[PDB]
């Protein structure tokens, strides 16, 4: 039982670390495209009417 839960502890650590890194990558590349769009939206001189 102690051998098995040793394995469980290390597997759970590996899971949480790889999630950390993928999530930080996704967050930075999200912020980049939002910066791009909010930059180009300041370039409009005549908006649309509806």
């Amino acid at each position: 039982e102690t051998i098995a839960t040793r394995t469980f502890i290390h597997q759970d650590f590996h899971k949480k670390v790889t999630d950390l890194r993928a999530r930080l990558l996704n967050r930075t590349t999200q912020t980049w495209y939002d910066i791009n769009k909010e930059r180009r939206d300041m370039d409009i001189v005549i908006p649309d009417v509806n």
Partner: peptide
């Protein structure tokens, strides 16, 4: 800032 965050991640 963003490109260095990317290359450092």
């Amino acid at each position: 800032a963003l490109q260095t965050d990317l290359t450092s991640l």
